[PDB]
């Protein structure tokens, strides 16, 4: 029917300050999906120490379409970090919809400054846990 499908996914990474990934290495989430009948599968991929030299001071975060879609997929997405109260903070939005094929990622190489994240005063790493939040809005042709 082409009805827009909206859904959210959240993922807690333990001991985030101790992650050994260096620049360009990736942490992968589990797959997730809507509650509709299409059953597109998605995942998040995060670069704890940045994608590349340009984003070396940042956490980099991407949404990837994992499964094989039956028709064209266009999606909007927004990433945020949950504080200890579960409140969304430091949100970054795609604004426009992007075309996804199987294996395609879209995201922000400069999602958040690593030094801002690691400062306990900002409350984004309670108990050294990083909880990432993604909302996806998808239309299928």
């Amino acid at each position: 029917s082409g009805k827009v499908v909206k859904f959210s996914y959240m993922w807690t990474i333990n001991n985030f300050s101790f992650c050994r990934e260096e620049m360009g290495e990736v942490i992968k989430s589990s797959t997730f999906s809507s509650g509709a009948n299409d059953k597109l599968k998605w995942c998040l991929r995060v670069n704890p120490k940045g994608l590349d030299e340009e984003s070396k001071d940042y956490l980099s975060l991407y949404l990837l379409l994992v499964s094989c879609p039956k028709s064209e997929v266009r999606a909007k997405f927004k990433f945020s970090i949950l504080n200890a109260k579960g409140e969304e903070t430091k949100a970054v939005e795609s604004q426009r919809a992007y075309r996804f094929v199987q294996g395609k990622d879209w995201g922000f190489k400069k999602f958040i400054r690593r030094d801002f994240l690691l400062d306990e005063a900002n409350g984004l790493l309670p108990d050294d846990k990083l909880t990432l939040f993604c909302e996806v809005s998808v239309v299928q042709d």
Binding site: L51, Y62, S94, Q95, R96, Y98, G103, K104, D105, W106, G107, F108, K109
Partner: peptide, 7 residues
Amino acid sequence: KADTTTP
């Protein structure tokens, strides 16, 4: 704006 790591 968003970036991608593929063509």
